[PDB]
Amino acid sequence: MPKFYCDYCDTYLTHDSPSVRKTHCSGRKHKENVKDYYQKWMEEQAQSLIDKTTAAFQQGK
Ligand SMILES: [Zn+2]
Where is this protein localized, as stated in its record? Predict the structure, then answer.
């Protein structure tokens, strides 16, 4: 599966490498940006499953 995609940003990356993916996730704003993805999922508030995936993704303690 070439090319990478960020469901939180609704965009399609072109270089799915180990530095490009981390380069895309190298800004504290990316966390607040995720709220825009699940802001209207069901007219409610869902700020729990994000910490489980943002912290337990690959190398987060
Ligand atoms: Zn993103």
Answer: Nucleus
Nearest to 9 by CA among 29, 28, 34: 34
Gap from CA of 40 to ligand 1 centroid (Å): 18
CA of 22 to the centre of ligand 1 (A): 10
If one counts the domains in the chain, the total is: 1
C-beta separation of 11 from 24 below 8 A: no
d(CA 55, CA 57): 6
Residue 38, domain extent: 1-61
Whether residue 9 contacts residue 33, with contact meaning beta carbons closer than 8 Å, is answered with yes
